[PDB]
Amino acid sequence: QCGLPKLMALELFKPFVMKRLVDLNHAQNIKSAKRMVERQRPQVWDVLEEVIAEHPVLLNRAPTLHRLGIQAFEPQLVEGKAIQLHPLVCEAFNADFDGDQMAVHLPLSAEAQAEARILMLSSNNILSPASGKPLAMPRLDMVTGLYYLTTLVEGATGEYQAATKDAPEQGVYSSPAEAIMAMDRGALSVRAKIKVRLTELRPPTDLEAQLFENGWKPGDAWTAETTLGRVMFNELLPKSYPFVNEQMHKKVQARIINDLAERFPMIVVAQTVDKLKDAGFYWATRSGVTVSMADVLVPPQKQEILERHEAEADAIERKYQRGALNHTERNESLVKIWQDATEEVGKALEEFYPADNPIITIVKSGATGNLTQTRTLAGMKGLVTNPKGEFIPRPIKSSFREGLTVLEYFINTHGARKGLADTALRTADSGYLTRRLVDVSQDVIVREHDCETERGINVTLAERGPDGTLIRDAHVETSAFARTLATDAVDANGNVIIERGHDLGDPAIDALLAAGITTVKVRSVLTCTSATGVCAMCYGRSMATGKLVDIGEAVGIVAAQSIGEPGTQLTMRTFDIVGGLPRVQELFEARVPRNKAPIADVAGRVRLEESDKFFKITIVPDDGGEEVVYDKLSKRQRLRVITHEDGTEGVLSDGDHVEVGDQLMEGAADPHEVLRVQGPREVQIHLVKEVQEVYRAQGVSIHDKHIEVIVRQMLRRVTIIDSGSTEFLPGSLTERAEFEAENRRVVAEGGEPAAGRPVLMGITKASLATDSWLSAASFQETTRVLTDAAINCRSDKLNGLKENVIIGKLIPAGTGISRYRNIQVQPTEEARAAA
Amino acid sequence: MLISQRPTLSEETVAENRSRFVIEPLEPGFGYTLGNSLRRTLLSSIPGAAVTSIRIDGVLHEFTTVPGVKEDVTDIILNLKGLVVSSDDDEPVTMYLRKQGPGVVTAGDIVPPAGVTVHNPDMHIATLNDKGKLEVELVVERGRGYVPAVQNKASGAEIGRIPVDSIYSPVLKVTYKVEATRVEQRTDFDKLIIDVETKNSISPRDALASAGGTLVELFGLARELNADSEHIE
Amino acid sequence: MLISQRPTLSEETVAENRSRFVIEPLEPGFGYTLGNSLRRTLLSSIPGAAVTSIRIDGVLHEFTTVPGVKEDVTDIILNLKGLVVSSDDDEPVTMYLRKQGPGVVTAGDIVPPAGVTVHNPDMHIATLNDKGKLEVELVVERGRGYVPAVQNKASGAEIGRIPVDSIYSPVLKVTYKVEATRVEQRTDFDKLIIDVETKNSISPRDALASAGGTLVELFGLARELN
Amino acid sequence: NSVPGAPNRVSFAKLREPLEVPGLLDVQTDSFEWLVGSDRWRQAAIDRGEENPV
Amino acid sequence: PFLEHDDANRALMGANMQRQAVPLVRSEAPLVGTGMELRAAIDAGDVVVADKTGVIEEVSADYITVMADDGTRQSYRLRKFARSNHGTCANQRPIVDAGQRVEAGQVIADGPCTQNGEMALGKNLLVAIMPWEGHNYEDAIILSNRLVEEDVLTSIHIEEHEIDARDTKLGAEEITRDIPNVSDEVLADLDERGIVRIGAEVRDGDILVGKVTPKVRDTSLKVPHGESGKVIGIRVFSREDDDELPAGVNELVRVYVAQKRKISDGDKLAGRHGNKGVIGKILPVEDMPFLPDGTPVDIILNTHGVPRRMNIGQILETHLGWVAKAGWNIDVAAGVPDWASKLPEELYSAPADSTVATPVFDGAQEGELAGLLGSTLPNRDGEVMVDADGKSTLFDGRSGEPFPYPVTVGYMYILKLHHLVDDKIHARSTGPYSMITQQPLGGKAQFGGQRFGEMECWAMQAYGAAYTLQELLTIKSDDTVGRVKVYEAIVKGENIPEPGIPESFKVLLKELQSLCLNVEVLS
Amino acid sequence: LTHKRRLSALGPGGLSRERAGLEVRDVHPSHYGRMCPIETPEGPNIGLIGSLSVYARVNPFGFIETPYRKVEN
Amino acid sequence: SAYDTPLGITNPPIDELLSRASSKYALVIYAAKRARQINDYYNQYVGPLVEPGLQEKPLSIALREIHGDLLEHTEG
Ligand SMILES: [Mg+2]
Ligand SMILES: [Zn+2]
């Protein structure tokens, strides 16, 4: 639902309403109706609830960073001059009610309205198409309400009182409907421990098996030891969902909704989150969260801390005046001192604030904020930067509650203005990366269901630390989940576990941690041997729908956007050493790194020599051939520490072993080296590993299949060497599929076919090395493109979006491909003769 | 002042002893006005009867478990708190329950005095063990709404007398919801949806009419001062 | 236990524009919502009277001054808005004001026809010097709540007629209190105490009575269905 | 204060301002005076600084 | 006030907000401010200061006359409902009475945003710091309806509409009343000259002044969509009268029409600490959280935006606002307590409505304020509605039941911002197109639609939505026969026609067939 | 009043959004008493436009002065 | 399987219509074509196989049809 004004809809729906007028005889000639709606007679308001009835509209907010930035809604006619928006989408639109405008687009044709209801409807676009996580989940105030409702107060009023040889339990109720009659008297706190009798709520699994043993039914009674808030919460969840009985931190809510989605339909989850917001709003107004300089509490230990640290600062300055210390090392030590005082003040603040405090509740509930702000407010702002970007050894030993002095308030403007300045260049860098990632794609639509391959990449799922337990890898919901299998699982006994062609989610993870198996082979786009695009099985399950991806789904734009959107959350350049957006740009463009590290062209052992400021490694192989050498190794780049699981390996040393493609120096290998030594597949895997390392280290969840799409398109061509018997020139760039099909269909005299070597390109060259001429004529030099294309009698297969937009024709995605446009519809014979 | 649109009351049955009423269209604001009043009127202003205490043989101390019966004292207390019972004398009437010998006991195995009625006679109470039995007294009386236990008895003249919370109201749950409506071209009116869940001793409709009567009595106790210049419909 | 005592309503006077009513006894958890229903009906819908439009000799809109007058027209109107009247007819009527030369036009300087009553004739309307002449016509009407200015293009056609924002409510401030008094605590009870303060156009009693009538005619819908 | 009609606005200030805030848009008028050799500016200069105010 | 308790970003935003704040019909100065509004109001110049000491001879709203102590009679004139360069009102109003004896440097009249010579850009409003039923979510805010009934935050906005009458080859533009075939009533509000009549209310599309270019034509001036109101003024210049005019022009008419604007939803509000938000719900007074005095609050602000933004200076502002609207008296019977040491002997007490000053870096500390939150003289009935922590038990105007927890309450000075609704709302179905590009004339003034850039296309392609994207790029923006046929198909009720062949291709072809490129389309 | 006390680093003879980087848009310890470290727009004019302090005036040469109390012994 | 009455555009549910067809876009087309059929009927043709309403936009009629298994789609 969206709330739309009246003098806005009216304009949008002027034709439909003129139609219903000239039909309902409020106007005789369409010009009379247009004049009417132009002066807005009082009769153009009683039909506008007839056309609006199930005629969606699309809401857009700029900047549009990804898919959910446009969403369809059903209009509810409200009076005013503002748009009423649901508080659960705002996290996707990235909206706030502080002056933010928004645009409304009306679809007209049947195809458009149906796309809006079925694809672009908000009740269906619940999950991120980047990680599968929910976005239409409860926000700040909802979280506060549900964290107040579902929390336990040891010492409350109306609690269970441990029968005492004189009275029974004294805190027990026969139904929620009775604890509510108590609540409304003063006898029961909604957050008190009690025993209730529940019939309509399904117990947990432990009890549902420990008390029934034949299956719990609606109407069967059990006795729960809970609060009334947890009950009224679990009455918002589906009839069958087990009773939770847990404080509803935002993470727990995310969990529950993930489960609902992985087990129930998506209409159910929409209804459930609607219920949760209603209730969280009810119970935030009735939570007691309100600010007051009393509620803002100052630790008492602060003074002891600050003076204890000023003692050490005095000592430092004494050294400085004694000559045992320079003017920069001094500042370094002062910073390293007044950086710990802030830690201690924050720790004290955490250990002194009660839990019933609103400033700690709004934080620990996961609603908004963090403890660094809480320190800045009740503790101490601490250190601040200069306009350069360095630190200032003079800290801010005052909070915004005490009140900064004049100077403190002066040296805190530097970083503030730096932020307000940078916060457009940051957006621009992210947008540049996204523009590239989108241009390299536009041909990666899903075209078929399966390629009938066993090609796949192997994924680790867990590791055994103590060697008797396997430990579940951390980034397995990004590497293994949502993917599709290629080889039936197997254990040391030869027993099958999971089937091939299977989705792979928490169920399969659980049931594969059983047989002690950790490395399972999975399918990927990096291996889909398809003519154009990828098979729906190599890709996996779409994270929006949670099921297998459909045919015609544009998955390159999805990856582009899923990588761009969090780009502002990353470190940047000074307006490698800082591996953020610069590193991503350094990988997707196949650039030689600054801190390049050399890898092992061979396996074997190492002889390590070192002289003044230089390392020289010599790899004596294990086969018995020619040893290689790496001689001019700047001792600046120390070495490749390994930190093996056991024994505390430490550094790479002499007599140690080396696998091919292994890294000798700490730093960053060169993709082209990896490519020639290891090969294309390992190149792709290395690139994905590095990109996802970058992101992970900075708290962004992107499933590797997006990285894999882009990479795939970066290693999608060959340079020909020996034409063979083919219509190919040497030194030319030819797409690997055409190349395979050409040197494969040539069977006549198939004794010397074309020879080619892979080449590693970037996401900007790879967009110049395209096979179309409409796209490339819209980007770069038109006349030469057209000349060359015309002498070669080129053909544009229209496999992409760019050229289809240019022409003005439909796109080869979703409701554009032949499979769908030309669907024939007929009523059944049975229901035809029912006229 | 003649009000506009003459609001109407429609019903919508959901079960036998559960219903959902809708009042529409109300002037803007009269939904939250009377909703909570109605709610508290239904939940604490219709008189009815309920158990008030019980007396079991065997358990004078250590109110944990009862001989030769599978349930503890607590599940039995709950079951009886769910007991539905009328009364016509407004007096601490007393009833008895005995099912000597193993089996399964239901309110149907209660023999009440005059007037005292039991609409839910199949309610489960206990499941006796082989060579077991049950003897208990049930104190019943009348009142309104909900009343926690009563232990304002300085000395115990009745030992083993376990007092229990008392649901004197035939109404167990009510929830109201105000929604918007448009009348002719002005939305932001008030529609009121109130859902009622009672005991078999009365239909929702009857409770709603009783509450309406009570609140009429009160606001007439207010209107009797001057009886002039109000709304009319 | 049960109870057979029915609630009574005793009045009390704090002032002429004010009063305090006491309703007792009452079921526990019953008085807050009762008092709030009364309060809502009071603050919302108590019939009254207020100025509906004005007209003046020389000026033609809210955005021009009057010779000799120290206040512009908007300030004059914002001072009129604090005016209280009481019409005894379900029809619109007309009041007249005429003033010349130095001095302060108060509300006492008005000529209310029979039926109307200006209950604050010490209200400052506007001051005048040896050059001023203030000739005003007011319209008066009945209604409830707040009613924005019906624009002259929408009402009858004329020029010079200035429509104004009407506030038909004699009630000025309402609050309620609940003393959980209990008859020696044998069983909880509630005592409700409403404190009411009016604009002096009509007494509290009349307002509480109007609220009672409204709520009777409302809850009669639950009464009816048997 | 330093203003005749001074609506009394109590102050929590604990210091005394030894220098009254100047005219706040003098930055404009003084400059336009220097441009037309107005006598106010001529004396303002002579009163401290140079001898021939140009 | 309380700057050292805010952060530089939010203080920056507060500053730049005050600087965008409309003048209200009635101005009220901050109950809690800084010793800096009086002097700003003086130095700016929208007030009137006594040239020479003297005695107020005469006083009207258009003229003030001071017979000085030296014998001369100065006569100041006042600007009434004077349009600024931004639609505001610059009305001045006197604050002195005859016979009064004024010094020199004394304020004789107030400006648009002054009250007794000190900036009054906003209003002191009774605020509750609490989350309400989800209507103050993510920086939105909640209002009473007393701010509309009593036109507290109401503003006047004036606007100027000019039409020129110039010469032309075909003939000379002559401004008149009569016109080619139109209604006979539309000329109601038009005087004998063809220019609208003062004191007349108007409406979009209606006529202000009548102009003509020969043929003949109807070239009259009409109010743009949305803007409306009452005709204030007509400023008319004529060649003949010889006042002044440009070249090629002969006559000029400016019209000044005004609009009183009450605070609706969608309008923007703020405070002096970087705390703004649109208005989500304007609530009746009977459903607002009211106090144990019967006093409803006026604005409800949420708790969630304060502690992550570091703008707590508004909390202190609020507290002191209470402390002022309700005066105080420190009990110094035994001696000044350990927290009034640094205080003057003039803040030990104060009546109600007692403005105060907390200079930015020499102002109210926190001990002083916590102590003064206890003194806080009782009310009309001897009860203190607010605790010594700033918190008052409240009551719900919907349930009638009190909220279980005390709530921070007080009086805060807020501001109404030029970012209104009517001047930021837009909508289009089919209207004026460019005629140089075949697209709508993009613009609020040209009545142009919104743009559909590259990123929106990206999102739409990523939905797989392909008929709507084609619908936007062809049927709605550039195509011409498509727009016609779709408007017709919808106003008639026949299903929408289907694409033919892209028209951005049926012609591009005819450019490559011109370079002798044999572009062919094949299966 | 803030339009008249405004300082612009853009216009005929000044600079443009090309040279206008991030060190001219910074706060400098030479602004204390001469330029406000707070008052400035939020968008593409951050740091260029500014506002003159209250106790500051302007040398005839064009350099901004701020007053200081003098201290002896 | 256990939920509440879908409202408006949410009716009929969507996880059911996805069982009639192979994908979301097939459903989009499968409904739009029926909708054009119905609009042409109402303007000139099997028409609604299901009880229409006062306006009951042809798309909702088509989706109710689909929910009743009253049609059949063959991909292209
Ligand atoms: Mg925003
Ligand atoms: Zn594949």
Author numbering:
A (entry chain D): 440 to 1014, 1024 to 1283
B (entry chain B): 1 to 233
C (entry chain A): 1 to 226
D (entry chain C): 21 to 74
E (entry chain C): 586 to 800, 823 to 1130
F (entry chain C): 440 to 512
G (entry chain E): 24 to 67, 75 to 106
Would you copy out the relevant sentences from the publication that reported this structure?
Here, we present structural data for HelD from Mycobacterium smegmatis (Msm) in complex with the RNAP core and provide insights into its function. Next, we provide biochemical evidence showing that in addition to being able to hydrolyze ATP, HelD can also hydrolyze GTP. Finally, we demonstrate that HelD can both prevent binding of the RNAP core to non-specific DNA and actively remove RNAP from stalled elongation complexes. To summarize, HelD clears RNAP of nucleic acids; this likely happens in non-functional (e.g., stalled) transcription complexes or post-termination.
According to the position of the HelD domains within the primary channel (PCh) and active site (AS), we name State I: PCh-engaged, State II: PCh-engaged and AS-interfering, and State III: PCh dis-engaged and AS-interfering. In State I, the other side of the CO-domain, the CO-tip, butts against the three-stranded sheet of the β′ non-conserved domain (β′-NCD) and an α-helix (β′/122–133) of the β′-clamp just preceding it. The only significant ordered part of the PCh-loop in State I, the protruding helix α16 (HelD/451–468), is erected against the β′ three-stranded sheet (β′/1164–1210) and the α16 tip locks behind the helix-turn-helix motif β′/271–304 by HelD/Tyr466. Altogether, the α16 interaction with the β′-clamp might be helping the CO-domain insertion into the primary channel. 1A-1 is connected with the N-terminal domain by the NG-linker (HelD/145–173), which orders only in State I. 1A-2 is then followed by 2A. Notably, helix α3 of the ordered NG-linker in State I covers the putative NTP-binding pocket and partially obstructs the site entrance. State I interactions between α6 and the NTPase site, and α6 and the NG-linker that are NTP-binding prohibitive, are broken in State II and the NTPase site of HelD becomes wide open (NTP-binding permissive). Finally, HelD binding in States I and II also leads to the opening of the RNA exit channel between the β-flap and β′-lid and β′-Zn-finger by about 15 and 21 Å, respectively. The PCh-loop, which is probably flexible in the RNAP-unbound state, folds partially upon binding RNAP (captured in State I), and then it penetrates deep into the primary channel, fully folds, and binds to the AS (captured in States II and III).
